[model samples]
Target: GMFKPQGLYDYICQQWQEEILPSLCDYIKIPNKSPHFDAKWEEHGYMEQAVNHIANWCKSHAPKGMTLEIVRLKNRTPLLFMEIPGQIDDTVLLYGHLDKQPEMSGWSDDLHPWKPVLKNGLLYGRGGADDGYSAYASLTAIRALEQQGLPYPRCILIIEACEESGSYDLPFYIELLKERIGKPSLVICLDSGAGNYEQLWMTTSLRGNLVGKLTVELINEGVHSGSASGIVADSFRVARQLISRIEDENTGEIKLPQLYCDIPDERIKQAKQCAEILGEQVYSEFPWIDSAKPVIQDKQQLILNRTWRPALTVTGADGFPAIADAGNVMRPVTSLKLSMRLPPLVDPEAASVAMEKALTQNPPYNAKVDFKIQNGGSKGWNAPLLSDWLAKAASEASMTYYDKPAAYMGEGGTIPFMSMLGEQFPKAQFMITGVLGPHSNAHGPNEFLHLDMVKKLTSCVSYVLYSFSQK
Candidate 1:
């Protein structure tokens, strides 16, 4: 039975304004930071609050015959599990995360992390778009289809709490629930990004993440700079020399050969398509400070640089004196926390090893150098080729909801769950998309959920769900 677009979209919008928005706002109020960000997460009980908050909402607003459970492994974060008995014989898995990044700095006076404000159709708060809306939207899609009495596959919703922390705990839960999870043919990840809000955006690939600490120690204690200046080699200088072994300081390109991956022809085409559709918004969307410009002016190349190329950012550092506490002293050591973005096809473990060797081996001035990979890193995802029915549904769904065809591109950020699902369910088809559009500022201060865009996307999901059942 073909469901009319009007009924589905209108129902989704009603649900969002009346139920989902209020609940999502409450969710933002809970500071359920990921374990990596908050060491005292378990003691804080914010994760528990987040799990119960979403679970309670599901219990009240759930679809008929839906079973909800808040599952927890020992000493690990909790996951909200909801199951909907379906008419179809096959199963479909829907994934999201309730965990959030820390309350980043730089919120406008009225816009704070815990304070959710709805303005001009945008919901401003932390985790709202970075994906506090996922669980609500997941169920709303099923309800939208159910409203039309449309048949769908058995649906399993796994809203994890460790996705922001690289989804380390998810693997254990996925294994423990393997019997219940079964082997699904389709998986929809609501934790990715969109090129824009103009149309449905399907993620074709994702860059992997590798984070490690590079520490260079010249001495055990600080010494007077005047006495040590000429006799000693600075630890910061040695750190830069080591960093140059892997990255070109001037061009920001990774120099390691093993860390690189050849981009596929199809991915190259998608980048070009995205560049054409997004134009200068590809780079202009970023909140650039001062007279800063992108490294390159070629829009298509910039898309590739973000999606398929390797890049590094020095996220944090230590062993530096504060300006207010400034003294003329030679620091004993310098440690920089490096975040390396790997290509979709590169193995993160191998990249981690390569990086470790590059930074630790043969230290200049014989300084004590150590590189430690965190969380063992996470691999990226390259989705399987879309079956004809799935691809057609995306196009039709976008046309129905946004009056435009669906657009496909690779995301620059990492969602470890995608890669895990890709390897575990090798045959599973993926529809990875999200509400992160222009100025959404996910993982940054002033982050928000594009309420209108999310409504449209949720409506589109109803269509996709129905189409998959038919296929």
Candidate 2:
């Protein structure tokens, strides 16, 4: 039997415009930030509101044989567990998250994080692209084949709320539902990026994120700069020197050995293919200033720089006052929220320990220094080699839907859940891809869901699932 691309596409488009799109618009109106941002996550009920909204829709609309439950543990964010019986013995787990980043600054006056605004074929709002839609799209993808009388493996959809916060609560849930959530043969995660919307962008790897707070203190309080300049060391400079130990001030390259890894030869070839396909769009997707430019001149190397290399970012700071306040004081302390992206295949736990030593050991001028690893660091993921069936199915699905072959690339951001799943299901196959395409601005203000891409991607998912069932 042949899988009709046009039929699936038509089905996805009709469903999106008729049902998923409207429901997702309402979903964008909820302010369900992860527990990390909203301390009173349980009390606020936004998390409940968002999950219930999606679950209710699923209950009414999803195909027969589906069982959905909003699972909750003691003081943990909820996880939407939806399972549909299948013809095959194997299970296919579809993953997505409903939690969102805190409302960021700079949303256009016409757009708001908690208000859904559709314009130019893109749905403007937070969480819609970052996630939100995947659950709907996942269900719709499964439903696409079901309505057509197609067969797939037993399917399970794990839509968790703690993903945005590094998924600390997810481990407990996975364990508690260990027996029920059987080992999956294939895992589909739609919480990643697309280099472009021209074709299906399959993510091959992701950089692991390591977060730690670095504090340098020289004294208890600030003192007059005029009096302390000559006698005491500046805490800011001391912290700068400590950070310099791990990062090259000139090139911004991480200097730590543990952070580096061998980029697989296959990944390098794939990067070249993607570079040829994406060209300058690789770096140009970023909103850079006129004077700003990419560090790596070669587009392919630049792609590798983010995916397979280590980069450091100072996310937040303390002990620095605004110049408008006319501060002439030597601050006694400086704290920096250090967030570094480690290469895929780099052991996050080992990297975390190495980073703690690199930043804290032998402080400058005897200043106090501390580096506390946050959330024990998140492990990076390098997807296992795709089975021949999946490799062919991926390209065929892309060609069918987008009229172009699938392109593979590594993502720079971390999705701690992937590494966790990879460890738990070492032999499982993964389709780690998504719709966070160019200029989507995930986690930033004015984030959007590329409605057109979502429709095609949904069709592609059905195509892949159909092929997987054959395998």
Candidate 3:
């Protein structure tokens, strides 16, 4: 017996308002930045604290026969694993992360990363939607089904704590727990973005990230700019020249052959449809200057640029002193943190090698240039085509809760676990969607979760789960 539409919506709304919000606020208060950003996470104990809080809450709410535990390995963030039995033979794997990005500055006056404030249907805090609400929402979806006396297959929920850092620790846990966690028929990841809050948006692909540090050292030490102007090549200038080898100077397109791939005709057609639906949102969502425009005016190309093409960005830099401390000196070195987003079909390892060679081998002044890979690179994931059953269910669920049809688009971000799971269970169908929509920034300041959207998404999850079980 499934819950009627109104009954399901009402139950999910109540659960979110009463039980989930307070827990999310508590979860947000813990500054559990990912281990990559917070190197001292073990001693800091915030990660452990956050894990304990969720484990305790889940233990209390878990169904009578459900099993929950926090899986941990040596020198790694914990993974919150839970199992709920059902009548069907199939299993559904639900995935999300509890780790958050570092606390970037420039939050609004009334908001902060570690402080949760609910106002006007938004919960202002880090990890609230990207995605601390995941575990809670997963449990609630199963609970809603049970409350309505509906049958489902076994469900496995994995909330890792190192996803923001490229999920380095997850593969170990997955291998360790492979015996306990059987292969799933479906994978539902709530760690992606929605195009807009007006409808249900599903991610069809995720871009890979090839991030590293490039350091260019021109001299042994800093020297007076007046004395070294002609004698030594500027380190920063050499660094700029090195980057130009990988990226076009006029257009920001990546020039490296290894970083790009042929966009599939199916994906290009989907991109056009998504761009039509998004229209100006393809470029307007960003806060740009009055006269600024996108790389190209074609909306479909902009969409393709973000989702299916390669792009480069200098996320961080060093070797330059503060403006107040700066003197007339030519710095000895210039170090830049390079973040390159690769197309879905490109190989990250090959791209990494190409990037390193392009930037480090051919230096403008034969400078001491080095490209040190930061961590394991993540390959982009292109999801398998949706089955007719899944396609219809997603659309029906969206119409039921959002009063709009479901939209499909490729995301410009990377989720390391998705690719891992895809390889592990190639037959498993994916439904990747999330509450990060519109202006709800995830890694930057002013990150907030759409409270109303969470409730709708929770019900939608229940809808899809119910449909899957019935099928």
| Best candidate (score: lDDT) | 1
On residues 62-156, what C-alpha lDDT tens digit does candidate 2 reach at each position? 77689999999999999999989989889999999999999989989999999999999999999999999989999999888877888788999
TM of each candidate vs. truth: 0.98, 0.98, 0.98
Count of clashes, each model? 0, 0, 0
In model 2, pairs of residues that clash are: none
lDDT at position 82, candidate 2 = 91
Q: Mind giving the per-residue lDDT tens digits that candidate 3 earns over 256-367?
A: 9999999989899998998889989988888788889788999999989999999998899988899998998999889999999999989999999999999888677779
What's model 3's lDDT at 99?
90
lDDT of each: 0.91, 0.91, 0.90
lDDT of 1: 0.91
Candidate 1 lDDT tens digits, 121-163: 8999999998889899999999988899888899999999998
